[PDB]
Structures are given as C-alpha cells and as structure tokens.
C-alpha cells in the first residue's frame, strides 16, 4: 500500500503514536515519508546483507527475522515480512519498542536529518484526524 500524509497520520494516531514518549504525531509521519515515503512494501537490501522493511524501514539484522541475515537479531521478535503488511500495527509496535527501548527516534537518521528540529506539526496540518 502507499498511504497519504493524512491517511498515515490517522492510522499512526489510532495506533497511539501521537506523543508516544514525548514525540508529537508529526514526528512519526515525517519519519515514514523519509524512510518508506509512505510505501508499506518498501524494502531496501543493504550491503551488510540486511534489509530494511516497510513504512519505517526497520532493519533485518536487528529487529526482525528475514532468514537472509546470518547474525541477525529479532529484537521485536517478529518475521520481517510482518513489517510489509498493508496494516501498520506491525511496524508501529516494533517502532515503539525501538524508540522506547532507550534508542529514541534518533534511531532513524532520516528523522534526525529531515525531521528533528523542524516544525513537524506540518505533516498533519490539514488532516481530519
């Protein structure tokens, strides 16, 4: 699937990401745009051999199992495929762990590069949430 700024905002809001550990909803939407550009099936194979999955491009060598990364960990304890659903619950929960696992949203460099320190309320401006 390929959400739309607002369509995603809603879903993420519904899944309780708005002000999760202090992170305004805008933060997560903006994060998605720069990671998967809102495409739930987005997947990128990295040279280390891992692969980023879905809307938030979670990496296979750490949070999910894809069976293609030998040393891989599965911190979120789920199959990487899970993060490819058209429903975002998979990524959204895993995301909460990653962030609340003490890592913060700095976990996503994109968030750092493109979202940190930017009026992010803008990614939900004009959305009936």
């Amino acid at each position: 699937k390929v959400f739309g700024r607002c369509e995603l905002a809603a879903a993420m809001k519904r899944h309780g990401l708005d002000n999760y550990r202090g992170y305004s909803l805008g933060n997560w939407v903006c994060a998605a745009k720069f990671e998967s550009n809102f495409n739930t099936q987005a997947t990128n194979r990295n040279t280390d051999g891992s692969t980023d999955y879905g809307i938030l491009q979670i990496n296979s060598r750490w949070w999910c199992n894809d069976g293609r990364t030998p040393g891989s960990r599965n911190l979120c304890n789920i199959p990487c495929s899970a993060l490819l659903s058209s429903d975002i619950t998979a990524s959204v929960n895993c995301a909460k762990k990653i962030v609340s696992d003490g890592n913060g949203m700095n976990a996503w460099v994109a968030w750092r590069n493109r979202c940190k320190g930017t009026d992010v309320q803008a990614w939900i401006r004009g959305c009936r949430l």
Partner: nanobody
Amino acid sequence: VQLVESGGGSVQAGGSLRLSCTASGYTIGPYCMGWFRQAPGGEREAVAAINMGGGITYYADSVKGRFTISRDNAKNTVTLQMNSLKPEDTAMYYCAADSTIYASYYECGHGLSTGGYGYDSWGQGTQVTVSS
C-alpha cells in the same frame, strides 16, 4: 557504556602499530566503534569506523589504504592496525562507540565523517608517536 583502550606508543616511520578497544558496555551493542585522533595543532579528526554487526568499514582518506579496523574475538573489541605509519599520524587516538541501535540501516562512516554525530561514548585516548 564504558570503553577501554590498549596498544599505542611510539613507532618508527613506515612502521605498523596495533591499537585495541573493548566496549565494556555489555547490553545490546554498541552499533558502531571507530577511532578519532588529534594532534596539538588540530581539531579532532576521524580515523576509522567499523560496523559491529555486518562488519562494514569506513576510513578517512587520510588513513584509508594503510590503516585497518576490524573486530577482535573478545566481545565488543575492535582493533585498529596502523600500517605504513607517517609522523603526520602522530597524535592522540580516541576510541568511540555509538550506543544507539538504529532502526533502519545506518552506516558508521556517516557519523565518523561528520565530526562524530552519534558516537556517545569515548575513550581516554592513547598517544601514538611516529618518530620520523
């Protein structure tokens, strides 16, 4: 998330010298480990970074080709093998580790290059003096 440093000292021109660093962090990570160095007259410069997990390396054009970073056996221990040493290499070397377990894929070369954004844990340093 404490780092211990070994090796170093004075080596002669064209010589090789091994530096080692073990992140006693003992939790989950670190994600990155690399070295930075600094001469008297000089801002802290990047040397090398290796990606714990995946083992991808990144070097500064200044040491790329000579130096080699890698993971030693011992848990959270990386090793910087400095070869074809030049006096310009004389300086204080600092081990650093990024304790952040990145969600998507991250390359340690980025942080290292850009002044070290990400590297939250630092060593005390080890002096390396390449006697001309």
